[PDB]
Design a binder for this molecule. Structure first.
Ligand SMILES: Nc1nc2c(ncn2[C@@H]2O[C@H](COP(=O)(O)OP(=O)(O)O)[C@@H](O)[C@H]2O)c(=O)[nH]1
Ligand SMILES: [Mg+2]
Length: 371
């Protein structure tokens, strides 16, 4: 009964048909009993998720094979923040491109950002083909998309591209609805089933550290991923030198560490399966800077800026370095930056983090490269 799960969403330039396509998928699959149909205005007027406000619409649907959690956002800003903060992280993305307009810079930005934040697969719905009649023009637009995808390491020659009309399929023209079913067919067969968080190496951020007579040292947290059992040896990674310990028991999630004293463990470091995650100070990251109206910051970022980077449980100060030719980053903009932290942190590609000054959040980011 329960089907494999896949997180997806519609990326692309504004007004190329992201929200219409989302409505068309649910409306068409409702005819196969695979979804509850959602209207265009439900998805367009998206709810708010959150220390950063993001407008994200959530629809659900099923093919006969899989269950999809689908994410759609109103504006470009929401897509930058959703893909960075990982509010609803995706194992694949449906790239919507207008056949009349062709690829635009937000198409470029969403592909670059999708590659940098860890979106592993891409399917292309070439939309609004009811407005175009020249087939040579469609062939060229498709070539531009494939080359644009290859420019950012996606397999442009292998990625499925379906020409369709989200609107005409929404209004119920059966021949256009078939291109929706071919999109989902392409999604079922091209986007692989994600690995389970519990198949991955074990990882638990440390929040508190107690010492109760009769239980030694207790460490509390939330298992990010993986699984830990009784008597397993785990490493403590981040901030200090890495050290080993055995898990006496899990009490619920308080982990009793067999032979670690209380001052040898602190908030900020993580429990991990030995040799699975390592400490680092230097990394590159895709960062979004909060705009003025978001309570972020009314002055720009700059090279040498030294804010705190909140990784999982604690703040860690670090110095900022912006791309070549960039000196200031305005509020509301995003950028890729190099960061050198004061102290090492258990770090991996895809780790989210907030950027704060004192108490306030001025940015958000994803680790995209380790150094
Ligand atoms: N003719 C045509 N119009 C479309 C199609 N898809 C979307 N539109 C129109 O494009 C406009 C904006 O589309 P929208 O779904 O808001 O794109 P989004 O901003 O990327 O989510 C709307 O007024 C739609 O009616 C299509 O396949 N064909
Ligand atoms: Mg829309």
């Amino acid at each position: 009964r329960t089907k494999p799960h896949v997180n997806i969403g519609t990326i692309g330039h504004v007004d190329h048909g992201k929200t219409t396509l989302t409505a068309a998928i649910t409306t068409v699959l409702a005819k196969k009993g695979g979804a509850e149909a959602k209207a265009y205005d439900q998805i367009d007027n998206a709810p708010e998720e959150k220390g950063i406000t993001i407008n994200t619409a959530h629809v659900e649907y099923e093919t006969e094979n899989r269950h999809y959690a689908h994410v759609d956002c109103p504006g470009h800003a929401d897509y930058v923040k959703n893909m960075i903060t990982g509010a609803a992280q995706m194992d694949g993305a449906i790239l919507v491109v207008s056949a009349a307009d062709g690829p635009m810079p937000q198409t470029r930005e969403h592909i670059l950002l999708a590659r940098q934040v860890g979106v592993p697969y891409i399917v292309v719905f070439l939309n609004k083909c009811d407005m175009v009649d020249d087939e040579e023009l469609l062939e060229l637009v498709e070539m531009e998309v494939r080359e644009l995808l290859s420019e950012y390491d996606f397999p442009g020659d292998d990625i499925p591209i379906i020409r369709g009309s989200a609107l005409k399929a929404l209004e119920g023209d059966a021949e256009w609805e078939d291109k929706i079913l071919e999109l989902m067919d392409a999604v079922d067969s091209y986007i692989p089933t994600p690995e389970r968080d519990i198949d991955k190496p074990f990882l638990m951020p440390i929040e508190d550290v107690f010492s109760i007579s009769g239980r030694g040292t207790v460490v509390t947290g939330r298992v990010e991923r993986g699984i830990v059992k009784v008597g397993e040896e785990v490493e403590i990674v981040g901030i200090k030198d890495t050290q080993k310990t055995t898990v006496t028991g899990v009490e619920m999630v308080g982990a009793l560490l067999r032979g670690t004293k209380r001052e040898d463990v602190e908030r900020g470091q993580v429990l991990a399966k030995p040799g699975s995650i390592t400490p680092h100070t230097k990394f590159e990251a895709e960062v979004y800077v909060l705009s003025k109206e978001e309570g972020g910051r009314h002055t720009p970022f700059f090279n040498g800026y030294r804010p705190q980077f909140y990784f999982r449980t604690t703040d860690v100060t670090g110095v900022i370095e912006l791309p070549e030719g960039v000196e200031m980053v305005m509020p509301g903009d995003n950028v890729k930056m190099t960061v050198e932290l004061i102290a090492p942190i258990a770090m991996e590609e895809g780790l989210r983090f907030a950027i704060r000054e004192g108490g306030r959040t001025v940015g958000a980011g994803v680790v995209s490269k380790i150094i």
